[PDB]
Structures are given as structure tokens and as C-alpha cells.
Design a protein around this ligand. Structure first.
Ligand code: ATP
Ligand code: ATP
Ligand code: ATP
Ligand code: ATP
Ligand code: ATP
Ligand code: ATP
Ligand code: ATP
Ligand code: ATP
Ligand code: CA
Ligand code: CA
Ligand code: CA
Ligand code: CA
Lengths: 217, 217, 217, 217, 217, 217, 217, 217
């Protein structure tokens, strides 16, 4: 099993640490705040109060032993940048860091961060897509033009069949799944019916899907 | 006109406001900080400096005209809670609010928030899934058991065919798409080939996919 | 005997705790300030320094055992709201909370507070009634129209008898008590005399009493 | 004209100012905070931003015209004390001041305050009486021994008559009023009936009433 | 020997404590600052860190045993006033307090301070008298009209005799002493000579002395 | 014209400025606080808001015109020191400065201050002399050994004559003045009488006077 | 025109700006503090108040016109780093930055700083060399082994000649200059004499010079 | 060996302490910050946490034993000045102090500082000389007119000989050294060649050198 180190137990890093630990991985939670450590003590293999900008405390943690180190420090850009620098000079294989803005991304890029993440910005995009289009529940982009979308079926689609709703020739899309009352249906047959308030998964071009939304539902 | 209002120009709300504006929607940016307002002025239809906890300043914005109001206030839970309370008493149809923790979710729930979002927490889980499994790029959960995953093809899958990589019978899964050098292939034929570093889209049970990952790739 | 818990040893909560303890009830004083606890240590069954927003410290207090919990936190609305939420999730029978303003009342209402109190606001009304009318010492409202009032007798009423001051037919009111030099007289006979600077208790309609005040005294 | 001035727009003083204004009196609202002044501007004849510790600003208000000046300053004891001192040296007839603790009462006493009020402390006692005894709604003390109490009638008293509930001979008390469904009854006849959840007004000795509570209801 | 207590080890109180201790009196130095106590530890009989606003700590000091208590607290008027109040309620014979301004004097007056001192204000007057008149070194006022002054002899008075400088008939004053090279001369004879830069002590009317200054020296 | 400038409107400097102005001198009040300047505006010829550490603001005041500049800055030793330094480099004739402690005296000494004053320290000694000896009202030291003292006559000295109270032979001292009911007597004759509570002025050796106090009065 | 811009008017940057201006170069002084800008206004061609972390304010300065931009920001490492990042992305040719510590040097290095300076650190070494060796006034290092040193001639070297003080054969060094009473001598002849307290310039190996110091002087 | 004491472990003082310790001298590092002491603990003979403004702590250090004491306190001018004063009163032989500005220099001068240093200001001058003239690497001034300069050789001087570049007659200067690829050449012969990007050391008049720069290279 791979060993993970998470520095900065915020909302983001906290989720990572908690979710990773649930996966049965060796995860070390690191934070400068004692209260933070106490909170996630029950959600980590080891939890240590430490200042990650201190090289001596860093070596005391044995952070060189870890293949993955996650820097989830946000507000204090100084701490985030300085920590990443220390890690890179310690030849840490994989360093993932949470960024605050465009310029924070740039400096992390230059000092050799392996992966940079913008949690709020990315979610901001996702939720915005669901505001303008209440029909969509969730989605994933395959490219700039193609995407898979989970839709909330309306009354317009109630008791409609898959062959009634021709998507492969009329809109160039394909229905991938139907979720009814919790029960799930994968690669549903052309005779399969969709009822309102079910979860509908469609695959195809972005413009095509929206066209199906405007006309079909 | 569908009018959107975004209160709290943080990393999350800022993205929402910017992304909503990009889609060509009437969007009003609202913040207590003048510097924030000046920043997102170029990324909104209208940008106004205002304290959202003030009912008078709130009415001055013409907030009755908005169908959607997004409360993206984070650090100051008092402001977030009080703003949401004001909106519901002003009979705003749809109120989406960013939450800080479990208990903030609860109080927002009781006072009639329509949708509660945990941006950092949700991304934390997503990134954690990619930490433990370097193969996965992105995914979407259909249910507690079923998921769609975009995989980074390895050398083990280089120049391998779909009928060669039998997933419908061997693993109970199905290949949805292949992305090669940017070019995309939807519902690929059994003769379609996968090269290394291509994007592979697979659909099925979580455990099944992971089995394909360990043995297949 | 019923067991009471008082969180927030301010001027209000302090009085409650002190007065309840004097009544020979089991009362627990709780405050985040060590100095507060030391002050009311002599006025409680048990006095414990604790942060009421901490669920672990809350369970350590055994707050689930109490039928009555009084939240007298004022300035910090966050603490007051969060504490009440914790209590409600712990299924506490009776939760009384001190409020700061109209909107603080609303959120406490929504999260299931059993009784909300506005000490200063209510007293503000009481004292205001005594400013405009120096004759009144204290009072109680039976309804929007009817009230009982304690009056300071003037020279105009000196050596006047109850039958001389006809209140039942002339003003529709009734004299309930006379307090002379500390000595008290209940349901006084029609032959009973009132001297100046005595305490006079009258019952009837608000407008009628004021009429008696303008004309009678 | 009787002119009232309220200094210190807190919860207490704010209510006073608002309530005085409601009675149709000439009321001047005074506060050091501009936001406070703006708030109670609609609830006062005149509202002026001013530091009450400044004699020049005080004279500028035209404070000689006011017969009543209310000092409702709480947190800053220095401001409360200094303001009161200024008023008496400006020969203001009646100076009522809100007190924070025992020692604040003492110093205000020595410097010639006409009336000292303890809003939170007084309500604390009142509420405490209703905590230990859920039957009582409100009350007023005639003396150290005698009191008038408004009771919430129980099922034990449902459909019971006044002559049935003998209190003048059995408990030494007297029923003053009955409030049923909003309708009020003053000095009710011996044939008048009490239904559950009605408001019952009783007069007598404190111990006597409590005896009626334990045995009668 | 009399026992003295000095609260507030500032520049003023510090001098008092140091000077009193040098006189061989039992003096207690009291201050809230630990650093202050350490400084004057070598200049007092007993030195104790204590908050003088705390009644319990006050009794622990045994402050009731002292005939003289000096309150030399300046900046914090709250502490100065509250301390004096505690002392007066403890029936302390002689309470001397340092004042900050006119209104601080008034409240101390009302709460029963025995003597109030204005060190800086009084010295301000003294030094101002020496600025306008460089001839005067020091002085003492017998009344509004009469004073004793120590003068710095000029060249105009060099080698002048007392009988040459007639002061009893010409100016109505009298020379009291001559200080030459450190050597002192008391009640000097009419034949006694004064040299420049000696210290000259004159007694008489203020206007008369100034007249002697303008014409004589 | 002799022009005086007072920098630092504290208790000390404020008195100086006020007292100098009372004598009819051209006095400029200077302070960094606008509120201070407004206060002593009525007690100065000119009052200007200025930071005395700024050479430009200093020259703007027209400080070259002043022969006397008084630095009465206390708390901020940096400001006091820097101001004094500027004045000497601006070749100001006479610079008097208020000192905070021994070391502040030393640095001011080295940088060419003309006179250094310790207002609180000097009064502390004076008051201490009156604490140990309730008989003394005020005094002045002629040297290390000789002093003039104003005494409050006791009953022991009531109706006693000067020849009765022989001090020139019995104690080696001399009576300089007697103040009775406000009326003053200078160089009183051997037949002049002293009544109780009169002011007695004695001149001589410190030990001699104290001997007269113990035995004589 | 060669245009220089100096950002951060500290002790270091202030000297740079002042010195550059003295040489007759077009120099722009930039600082976030208005007081700083006002100060160096007289020592720059143009002086503008600006926050250097703001790209808009940066472009407003006309920073594209400058070939040299000096970042002399010290305390705020965030500002220093962010400013440098902005400059390189604005394609500024030569960016010189003042560093605070080793790690600040590293990050500035990675983001493309052209020259990094350690003013205090460099002087610290220089002064240290003069502490241990009182003979040396100043020096310059040619390499790790070779240096040029200016020495203060002792009495041991007074009236000694260059051929008398043989350094080319005896110590392997060479005398470059002699400064006597201000008068300078370059490449002095073998007959040239050295007097005490003259400035002696020697060139050679570090160890050789020190040997000459111990034995020769 | 001489014993050194360094107070104020900043960038400047830190370098001094580190460099001196490397020279094998007895050096004491003194700082009020515990973190500072821990940092330079490895770079000093003794390292002690102490407040240098405290005379008692100063004597505890045994600072009187040291011949050299370096005050490297910058930001807090009060501490720097007060420390120097203490040292001078302790008769410390050599006291070197770091200054912040012109006026800080003056007070240090007056209170008897032996040497005053301006690290940033001096370096500011040095670097400024290298900005305007990119050819110069480092230099030393012999006087106002004469200086030794280290130059970066250009292509214009590539493969040029010393006799080709006549400096003694044509420009009045002399080439002192050539540094090629790290290898150094001292007092190079007239036949010696210079290649580009070598370090060139020239000695002569400032204007003459610049003339050689403009025309020669
Ligand atoms: N030098 C440091 N060493 C260790 N932990 C640190 C350091 N600096 C910051 N942290 C921790 O990082 C955590 C989260 O950082 P912060 O909250 O500033 O970023 P954020 O973006 O606001 O967080 P979120 O992930 O909730 O958005 C905090 O709990 C803090 O204690
Ligand atoms: N009462 C208010 N009215 C209007 N705007 C407010 C109010 N309170 C806070 N804001 C704004 O909301 C913005 C975002 O708040 P904050 O930065 O605390 O969120 P966050 O927890 O950092 O979330 P994010 O992940 O979006 O950064 C702030 O820039 C602030 O100016
Ligand atoms: N999280 C907490 N846990 C325990 N006690 C708290 C907490 N937050 C506040 N308190 C306490 O509540 C007490 C009173 O609250 P606060 O004084 O803010 O309200 P208030 O309205 O100003 O008081 P008052 O009743 O005098 O009007 C304080 O003594 C404080 O210590
Ligand atoms: N010197 C002053 N002049 C005028 N107004 C003042 C002064 N000092 C305080 N105030 C005002 O008095 C108001 C009430 O004071 P404060 O909030 O401390 O009282 P409180 O103890 O909270 O009592 P309450 O129960 O009424 O809230 C404040 O809003 C403040 O603006
Ligand atoms: N509650 C308290 N108990 C004990 N000591 C106190 C208290 N409050 C203040 N002091 C002390 O009083 C001392 C002097 O008071 P402060 O310096 O505020 O008055 P000041 O007029 O500025 O002094 P100075 O006599 O130098 O003019 C301080 O050392 C402080 O520690
Ligand atoms: N740089 C400055 N320029 C002008 N005025 C100043 C400066 N620094 C301080 N002052 C003023 O000097 C005044 C007196 O200073 P401070 O109150 O610290 O003296 P203090 O020690 O309290 O002496 P006092 O016994 O006179 O009160 C303050 O009101 C302040 O406004
Ligand atoms: N973002 C910014 N934009 C413009 N100027 C800034 C910014 N941040 C700081 N400065 C300015 O830089 C100046 C120097 O910074 P600072 O005083 O922290 O440096 P220092 O470490 O003291 O170096 P020095 O040895 O030069 O004094 C400050 O006067 C400040 O006004
Ligand atoms: N009273 C004191 N006793 C001991 N050390 C002190 C004292 N005051 C300041 N110092 C120390 O002096 C050190 C440097 O001083 P400071 O950083 O204020 O000057 P600076 O000019 O900013 O430093 P630099 O040399 O980096 O320019 C700090 O580490 C601080 O701890
Ligand atoms: Ca966030
Ligand atoms: Ca209150
Ligand atoms: Ca003072
Ligand atoms: Ca510096």
C-alpha cells in the first residue's frame, strides 16, 4: 500500500484525508493547529501537530518516506509556497498542491509542483452549469465538444420509451442508464420506458444534448 | 429574463459568477469588499458593493427581480446564515448556499435553503480517488454501486482492440468512448483499437472496473 | 426536583442561575470564561468551565440528563445558535434561549427553540410606561385592553376613601390593595382610606385607569 | 412639552426610545454609532449621532430642554458614568440609568442618579420563577409576602366553577380575572366557570397560591 | 509607626512608595503588573502582585488594616474609581487618589475620597512660572497675593549689600536667606553681601517681588 | 516678543500651555491629536495639529521664532527623544523636556536638552512628606539641610504667642508668617498670637522643625 | 532612455533610488506608503504611490518603458515574490530583487529573477572581517584565495619605505597605493615613504597579507 | 583571542555572528526572540535569550567582560538606543551599532557609539553603480576621485593584449589582475592577453576608467 501525507486540514484537505483513510491507505494528517489535529485524529493513521515551514520538524515527521504529499494550505500562500519548496528540495516524488489564484498557480508551477488543483473554481463551473439548466444533476466532459450528462426526467418524458425517443439518429446521442426509485438499469434495451423524476444518463455532443432538452423534454 | 445574483465573491462564488456570465446570462455580482467588486466587474453584467446582511441594501439591489440567489459566503458563518434568512423572508424562489461544515448545513436546512453545496469537501473525495488510483482521470457516480470512469490507458492496453479487451463478458463492463490524440470516438465498434496514453471511458460496477484495472491494465 | 442547566453567565443568565439556586433546585452553571464560573461558583450546585459549541465537552457535562437548558448567550450569536442546535439534536425537552434581535429570534424559532426571551426589550417597554406616567410603579397586562396597575398615591387622593373614589361605576375599575408604611391591605373595605405616597393597586381598562389618573389624581 | 432623550441605543434603550415614540412623545435618539442612529431614526422624533461624554456635543443637542434623560450605556461603564455626571452638572431634573453590576449601581447612586435600572437581572428572576413553576405566566409583587399571579389553568380546573374552587376560605386567595379564548372576565361571579388553557388571575400570599397549585391544580 | 499602602506603581506612586520607604515607614506596594512589582521590590516593605478591583484579592492583602491607602492609578479611570469605591466600603480612614482630569476629580469627590492630587497640573503651573521668569528657581504661595521666592542672583546684584537693597521699606519685602557656593546663610544681617549666581530667598507680595526683579535686578 | 511653544498636550504640558496663556504670553499649542488641539484651542494664542517628529511640519509652525520650546511627550519616548533632537539641530535656544525615567533623562542630557523635568516624581516626594507628617501643608528646600515649611497649627498652639512659642532659642527656628481666617501676617511681632487651624510658616533646619512638631505642637 | 524603476522604498531601495537619481538617470520611485513616496519625491524623477502587487496599477505606471526594475521589498515576502512574478510575465528585461533569506532566494531564482541581492548579509561578512582585524578598512575579493585590502598603517610602518617594506619577495604581495593626509599616490616608487595613520593598499593572497599584518605591522 | 558580543540576530547581525564564529573567535549571540537563538545556536560559542534593555539580564550575561559589542537592532530604535546607553555606562571599550536613519545616527553619536554602520544604504550605493554600468562587478573607492574596479570583459576586448590596451599613458590607469575560467593572474605582464567574460581589475581615476569603458570596451 501507498503512503499519503496531507498537510493543511481544511475543508478540502480534510475530505481528502478522511476519504483516503476510509480507503485503507496509510495517511498522515499534518496541521499547525492543535484543534484541527484533534478533529481528524479519528480519521487518520497518524496525526501530528507541526509547522510545515520548519525543515527540522519536517524531517522529524519523516516526510521523505512518503511518495505522495498533499499541500492543502490555502489562505497562507507563504506557508503553501514555502512548504512545497521544502518538499521539492527533499526530492518528494509526487507533490499535489491546492491553489488560491492564477498567480499562486504560476509560482507552484515554477518550483516544481506535480499537480495543481482548484476545488472551488472547478465546482463553481459545475454548479453554474446546473443553475442555468435545472435539468442536469451532474456531468463529465470528454472534450470541448462531447460530454456525458445526468438528467432529471420531466413530465414531457413520462411513460416514453427509448425507441420513441430516438437519440442516435435524431440527435446523435445515446441513453446510457435509467435510475428508477433507486433501482438502476444499465445499457437499457430499446423497449425500456422512462418515467418522470428518474435519473437519465445521456451521451453525445453538448449542443445536441441541449437540443434534446429544449425539444424532447 | 432569468436573473442570477451571486453574493460572496470568493473562489467558489467568483467562479460561479464568472461562469454564469460566460454563458450569456444576466448576472449581478455582490460583495462587501470594494476590491472584490472591482475585480469581477469585468465578469458580470452588474457589480455592486453591498453588505448582504442589510435588508435595505438588499432591497436597493432590486433582489426581488432575481429568481436565483447564490450565497457563497464562507468564513463569516453569521453573514451566510443571516443572508439566507433574509432571502427566504423576501420570498426568493431558489436559494443556493455554500456550506462550511456539518452544522452549517443543518441550520441552513432548517431555515429553508433550497440547495446546499460543499465544494471543497466534494472535490476532496474526487481527488482522493485519483490519489489511490493514478489510472483514473475523472468520474461520475450513477448510484452507491455504479459509476462511469475515464481511464488513462497504459502500455498493457496499447494497440489492443475492443474485442481483444472483452469487458462485457470478462468484467461485466462496457467501453463508452476512446480519445486518441484529441480525436474522439463514440460507441466504438468491436474493431476499434486503443493506444497508450489515450482516454478510455468505461461503465459498470465499481468493483468490476477496479478488477479490470488490476488485471486488464 | 427538576434539574436546570444555564449556559452563558451574563447579567440575565446569572440572575436566573442565582434565583433558581436560591429556590433549592439542582442548577448547573456553564460558561466559557473561567472568571465567570468563579463568580457564580457560590451560587450554583455545580459550576463548570466549558465551551458549549463543543459536542464532546457537552456530552462530558451530561447535558442530555437535563429537562431544562437555558441558553443565555447574547453577543456571540454564533455560539447561541450553534449551542441550541446541539441541544435540539440531543433531544433536550425544554430549551429556553435569550435573543439579541428579530432575526436571531427567527433562526432560533426554525431550529426548534421552545421559548425565546427578550429581557431588555420587554423591560424597555415597562420602564417607558413609567417615564410617561410617573404615577405607575409597576403593572401587568391581562390583554391588549385590560391591565392591573400599581400607583403612587398623590396629595389629591390624600385622606380619600374607597367609596368616595367610586371606581366600579364611574370608571369601571376596582381597587385591589393598599400599601401603607409597608403594612399591606388586601381586598380593602369601602370604608378604607388612602393616604399619599401609599401604593395603590387598581384593576380595569387601560383608558379607564388613565382617566382616573387625569381626573381623580 | 415633556421631552425625552435616550442615550445609548442598545437592546434596552432602543426599546425605550421606540416605545416612547409609539406613545406620541417628543423623543430624541442619541448614539455614538452612525449605524445605530440610522436604525432608530424611523422610531424617534429626532435622531442625532453624538458622543455623550462630550459636553460640547451634549449642549449642541439642546439637552437643557429635556426633563428626562435616559442613559442606556452598558459595556462602556466609563461612558455611562461620565455621561450621568455631566447630566447632573447640567442640572437635568430626572436621570435614569441602566446598570451593569452592583458597583456600577453604587457609583451612579453617589453621583446623584434619580433611578437605576437592572433590566437583565430583573427579568432573570421573573423567568426563573416560571422555570421552577411552569404554571405561572406572569406576576407582580405587592410586597415581600404578597403577590398577584396569572396562572395557566390545567385539566384539573377544567369546567370547574369559582364556588367549586373555593379560594377565599380554602386557600385565603381570591380570583381576579378569567381569560377564555381571548374573552376577558373581570371580578367574576361565583357562578363563573374556568376551562382548561384559560388564563387565571389569583391574588394572595405567595405560599397560599403555591399550595393551591400543588393541591388545587 | 503608621502603615501605608500604595496602589499603582507609576511615576507618581513609585516616587511616593520609594520616598516613604526611605523614611522608615511600613509601606505596601501594590500593582497589577508583575514587572512593576519586581522594580520596586527593593523599595518597599512588602510588594504584591494584585488586581485592586478584585474584592477577594483586596481582603487577601489585608488592606483594611491600613490607615493610609494611596491610589496612584491614572490611565485606567475605571480601575481608579472602582478601587476607591472598594476602599470606602471597607471603611478605610485616609484615601488619597491621583486624578486625571476635572470630571475624574468629581466622581472621586462624590464617592468619598479624602484627598485628591493633580501632580502634573500643579507642576505645570510651577514650571510655567519659571519659564516666563528665568530668575525664579522655586517658590511657595502663602496666599493669592503673598509668596516666598528663590531667585537666581544676576550681575546687577553682584557685590550688593542687604542694606543697599532696601526691601522692607522700598518694596515691602524681606530677604530670608543667601546660598553661596553651597554654603547657606539664614536670617542674614543688614551688612551681608550678595554675589551673582547665588540663591536668593525673598518674601513679600507677588507684584512687589516682580517690581524688585524689574528694577533691582 | 518672547514666544513659547508647548509640544505634547498631556496633563503636564496642558497645564503649562494653559498657565502660560493666563499670564498673557504668546503661546503656541502643538499636538498630534486633533481632539487635544481642539481642547486647548481656547487656552492658547494659536493651536495647530502637527506631528512633532516631522521636520517639515515643524518648520511650517514657524518654530524658529520661538525662544522656548517645551517637549511634554511622555508615553512615546521615541517621539520625545526625536523631537528634542530636531529642536537642537534647529538651534532652538532653550529646550525643556518632560522625562519618563532615569535613562530617558540620560539620553536627553547627551543630546543637549537645557532643562529636564520629572513632574510626577517630584510631587511623589512632596506628597510623601505630607503623608508621614499630617502637620505639613507645603514646603521648599533651601539645601540638603535647610527648608521652609508651612504648618497647620494644632490645639496645642491655639492662642499661643510668638514669645510664648520661643523657636529662635528653643528650637533654632524662626516664624515667618501666620495666616488666620485668610488674613495674612508677615514678619509677625513677638506679641502676635496663633490660633488653631491657622497656617504657620517656619524656617530652619529640617531636624529642628520636626523636633518642634513632636514637642511644641 | 535607460529608465530605472525602484519598488519598495526601504533603507536599501531608498539608497538605490537616491543614488541612481544623483547620477542623472531617469528614475521612478514606487511605494505603497504615501509617506514614503513624499519622502523620496525630492530624490527621484517621478514618485508615485502604488501597490506593486496590482497588475493594473503596475501597467498604469508605464512599466513597459523601464529596462530595469528593482524590487526592494523586504518584510512582506508575499509582496516581493508576487511583484517579481508580475514583472517577468510583463517581460521586463532585467529584474533585480532584494532577498530576506535562503528560501526567498530559491523561489525568486525559480521564477526567473535576473539578480538576487543580500545587502545585510554581505555587509555582515565585511564588518566581521574588520572586527577581528582592526587594521583593515575595506577590501575586495578577486577570488576564493586572492584579495585586495586597504590597511591603516601603524607606528611600526611609520616613516618606512617601500623598499624597506619588501612585500614582493618577503610576503609575495604588492603595494598598490598610499594615501597620506588625503593626498593619493598611485603605483608608488620603491623610494616612496609611508607614515602612520596613512592608508595602505596591498594586493596578494589572503594568508600572505595577514602574515604581513602580524609580523610587518 | 578577542571576545565578541552580538545583540540583535537580524540579517545583518546574523551574518556578523556567523562569519565571526567561522573565524574561530569567541562570539556571544544575544536576542529577545527564542526562535532566533535556536537558529543561530549552531553558529555561536554561546547563545542566550535575553532582553538587552534590562540591566539585570545584561549583568547576568557578563557583557562587561567583552571588548567588542555589536548592536544590530534595527526596527526598534528604542531598544537599540537604550541598549547602547547601558553599554556605554558599563564602560564597554568598542560599541558598534547598526543605524536606521540619519537621526538614529545622531543620537547614537551623542551617547558615545564608537562606530555606526549603514549596511543597506552603503549596498544601495554599490548596486546602483552596477545598474548604471553593467560592466562593473565590484569596486572599492580609494578617495573621491580614485577607485579600483572589477570589470566584465566584452567582445570588444576579446583577444586584446595589455600592451595593445595602453592604460598607463592613454588613460592614466593600470591593469591589476585577470581572472580566466577561475584561474587568476596577478600583476600580469604586458604580453598578457584578455578574453571576453573574464574578470578585469583596473586601477585609476573614476572619469578615466569610464573613458576606457566608453572607448576601449
Ligand atoms: N505552516 C503550516 N503548517 C501546517 N499547517 C498549516 C500551515 N499553514 C496553514 N496550515 C493549515 O492549513 C489548513 C487550511 O488552510 P486554509 O484554511 O488557510 O486554506 P483554505 O483554502 O481557507 O481552506 P479550505 O480547504 O477550507 O478552503 C488550516 O487548518 C491551517 O491550520
Ligand atoms: N455580509 C456580507 N455581504 C457581502 N459580502 C460578504 C459579506 N460577508 C462576506 N462577504 C464576502 O464573501 C467573500 C467570500 O467569503 P470567504 O472568503 O470567507 O469565503 P471562503 O470560505 O474563502 O470560500 P471560497 O472557497 O469561495 O474562497 C469575501 O470576499 C467577502 O468580501
Ligand atoms: N460558546 C460558549 N460557551 C459557554 N459560554 C459562552 C459561550 N459563548 C458565550 N458565552 C458566555 O455567555 C455569557 C454572556 O453572553 P454575552 O455577555 O455575550 O451576552 P449579553 O447579552 O451581552 O449578556 P447579558 O445577559 O449581560 O445581556 C458570557 O459570560 C460568555 O462567557
Ligand atoms: N459615549 C457614548 N456616547 C453615545 N453613545 C454611546 C457611548 N458609548 C456607547 N454608546 C452606545 O450605547 C449603545 C449600547 O451600549 P452597549 O451595547 O454596550 O449596552 P449593552 O450592555 O449591550 O445593553 P443592552 O442590553 O441595551 O444591549 C451602543 O450601541 C453604543 O453605540
Ligand atoms: N486594577 C489595578 N490594580 C493594580 N494596579 C493597577 C490597576 N490598574 C492600573 N494599575 C497600575 O497603576 C500604575 C500606573 O497607572 P497609569 O500608568 O495608568 O497612570 P499614569 O497617570 O499614566 O501614571 P503616572 O503616575 O506615571 O502618571 C501602572 O503600573 C498599573 O500597573
Ligand atoms: N510625535 C508627536 N507629535 C506631536 N504630539 C505628540 C507626539 N507624540 C505624542 N504627542 C502628544 O503628546 C501628548 C501627551 O503624551 P502622553 O499622554 O504620552 O504623556 P503622559 O506620559 O501621559 O504625560 P502627562 O503626565 O502630561 O499626561 C498626547 O496627547 C499626544 O497627542
Ligand atoms: N505591495 C507593495 N507595493 C509597493 N510597495 C510596497 C509593497 N509592500 C511593501 N512595500 C514597501 O516597501 C518598503 C520596504 O519594505 P520593508 O521595510 O519591509 O523592507 P526591509 O526588509 O525593511 O528592507 P530595508 O533594509 O530596505 O529597510 C516599505 O516602505 C513598503 O512601503
Ligand atoms: N531589546 C532587545 N533585546 C534583544 N534583541 C532584540 C531587542 N530588540 C530587538 N531585538 C532583536 O534584533 C533583531 C533584528 O532587529 P530588527 O529586525 O528589528 O532590525 P532590522 O534592521 O529589521 O534587521 P536586519 O538586520 O534584518 O535589517 C531581531 O531578531 C530582534 O529579536
Ligand atoms: Ca475555500
Ligand atoms: Ca444586555
Ligand atoms: Ca503622567
Ligand atoms: Ca534591513
Amino acid at each position: 500500500n501507498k503512503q499519503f501525507a496531507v498537510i493543511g486540514l481544511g475543508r478540502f484537505g480534510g475530505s481528502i484525508c478522511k476519504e483516503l483513510h476510509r480507503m485503507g491507505h496509510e495517511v498522515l494528517a499534518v496541521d499547525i493547529n492543535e484543534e484541527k489535529v484533534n478533529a481528524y485524529a479519528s480519521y487518520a493513521t497518524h496525526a501530528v501537530i507541526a509547522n510545515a515551514t520548519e525543515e527540522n520538524e519536517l524531517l522529524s515527521l519523516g516526510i521523505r518516506n512518503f511518495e505522495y504529499v498533499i499541500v492543502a494550505i490555502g489562505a497562507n500562500i507563504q506557508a503553501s509556497t514555502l512548504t512545497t519548496l521544502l518538499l521539492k528540495e527533499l526530492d518528494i516524488p509526487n507533490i499535489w498542491v491546492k491553489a488560491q489564484n492564477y498567480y499562486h498557480h504560476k509560482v507552484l508551477e515554477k518550483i516544481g509542483a506535480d499537480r495543481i488543483i482548484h476545488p472551488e473554481k472547478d465546482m463553481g463551473v459545475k454548479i453554474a452549469q446546473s443553475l442555468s439548466d435545472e435539468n442536469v444533476l451532474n456531468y463529465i466532459d470528454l472534450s470541448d465538444e462531447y460530454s456525458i450528462v445526468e438528467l432529471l426526467a420531466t413530465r414531457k418524458l413520462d411513460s416514453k420509451s427509448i425507441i420513441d425517443l430516438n437519440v442516435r439518429a435524431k440527435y446523435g446521442c445515446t441513453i446510457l442508464a435509467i435510475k428508477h426509485h433507486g433501482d438502476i438499469c444499465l445499457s437499457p434495451a430499446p423497449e425500456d420506458i422512462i418515467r418522470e423524476q428518474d435519473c437519465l444518463v445521456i451521451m453525445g455532443h453538448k449542443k445536441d444534448i441541449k437540443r434534446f432538452e429544449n425539444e424532447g423534454m
